[PDB]
């Protein structure tokens with residue numbers, strides 16, 4: 171069937187859309203080539219619509235059925251809890267899209283009678299009605315990139331009341347079931363440090379390793395009605411409250427498998443028969459579907475001793491080499507099996523015999539040295555997108571601060587330490603906002619974090635070595651230096667000067683600011699300060715940062731204020 175059908179009504183914005191990076195002094199201090207930075211808008215939605223619309227011709231076989239049964243046997247161990255309306259409301263981000271039913275996310279979080287009454291009515295409707303398709307809004311996503319232009323991605327999501335019901339029925343399932351089914355292959359259970367540990371250990375555990383990333387083209391569009399019902403058959407293996415079993419059954423047929431598309435003007439836009447990007451099950455469903463197809467495809471291709479790592483549609487496989495010619499033919503057989511399963515490739519996969527040459531979750535393993543000179547592996551990435559977005563977030567107030575998430579997740583990197591930390595600490599200190607909580611996203615869930623708490627967060631996630639790394643790889647230094655020239659970012663000597671200046675100001679303030687000066691900026695001086703374990707680090711409640719993926723799932727993981 172067709173992934174989408176369209177009526178001809180346009181994908182519309184619900185307000186003016188900004189496409190160009192503003193010419194602003196603060197963003198200009200970071201990046202001078204402002205014309206190279208753009209944001210996607212609804213103006214490119216028709217180009218995306220064409221790419222995402224195609225027929226799917228899925229063929230399943232014995233390997234697929236065998237893997238599915240193995241996955242279901244593990245899912246059979248799960249006991250999932252139904253969330254109360256109150257627990258589900260508390261998981262709603264404060265700036266979540268309002269309902270069309272007279273209330274918003276703040277009303278949901280406050281347990282307002284209008285919000286709660288409506289959510290209850292939606293819940294009762296899921297229990298009673300097993301068929302009526304649930305309306306969804308389709309919007310063009312606004313994302314910032316550097317030129318060389320990508321058309322806007324399309325987001326599809328149901329109303330706020332439905333999103334709260336999805337949490338009640340499925341938040342516990344999507345949080346716990348992926349690891350029960352996929353074990354060590356489930357990517358979202360790992361912090362970046364644990365991910366690099368798993369990749370390096372897996373790589374070195376093979377006699378002669380071969381690894382590859384597999385890029386599925388337009389993964390959400392490749393997801394079939396069969397795949398969604400297969401996904402539900404795994405969820406159905408959980409022990410569930412009867413209303414949760416009905417709600418999962420109803421949500422599967424009325425929302426997850428497909429449904430009508432409405433634009434921001436309320437016009438009938440089309441019909442979806444593939445994965446919606448903006449529902450609670452997107453991450454979990456995508457991961458299960460990708461793991462299932464890839465595990466079966468590995469068997470069809472006769473790949474030896476596979477270890478996979480999956481995060482949604484992002485797949486990396488590390489196996490035992492059978493020889494160069496054999497590996498090349500076995501990868502072609504894997505691709506052919508994936509294509510039959512409706513997971514055709516974007517970039518054709520290529521065997522890799524150097525772990526540092528593999529990109530997974532847009533990241534690569536690199537090496538640096540700590541204060542003792544010992545090798546430390548860490549995850550890095552090309553800094554182009556992070557810097558273009560950091561420039562955008564400097565010029566405009568954005569709901570999610572990608573810069574903060576990048577500092578947290580890429581804390582050991584040369585670029586996050588020298589550029590991101592220096593830039594934002596300089597500006598926030600000047601504005602008396604170092605202690606002001608900001609929203610960022612970790613594995614798709616929203617968190618409200620104070621920049622002053624970064625030292626303990628980094629110590630907990632990455633270890634104290636994140637504050638001592640030096641002698642970065644020549645390849646990594648070259649990539650950073652090249653990006654800076656491309657974007658018109660000041661050279662690293664300028665960043666060192668700016669860091670020495672903000673470090674001095676931070677130290678002069680005492681308190682948490684002085685902890686930031688000491689730990690975050692020790693790289694900037696010769697007269698190193700002693701870095702001991704931060705008392706605040708061990709007390710940090712990181713319960714739930716690295717449990718599961720929630721991208722598009724409308725999840726907020728920071729604490730609710732007691733009413």
Ligand SMILES: O=C(O)c1c(-c2ccc[nH]c2=O)c2c3occc3c(F)cc2n1Cc1cc2c(=O)[nH]cnc2cc1F
Nearest residue numbers: 362481482484531532533549575576579580611612613614
């Ligand atoms: O956004 C993520 O879920 C994320 C981060 C992250 C980075 C920065 C801020 N907050 C974050 O959670 C992250 C991450 O951060 C550092 C290492 C590392 C890593 F290995 C995997 C990581 N993921 C999964 C993830 C990231 C990307 C991606 O970035 N591009 C394309 N496809 C992707 C597919 C994915 F499944």
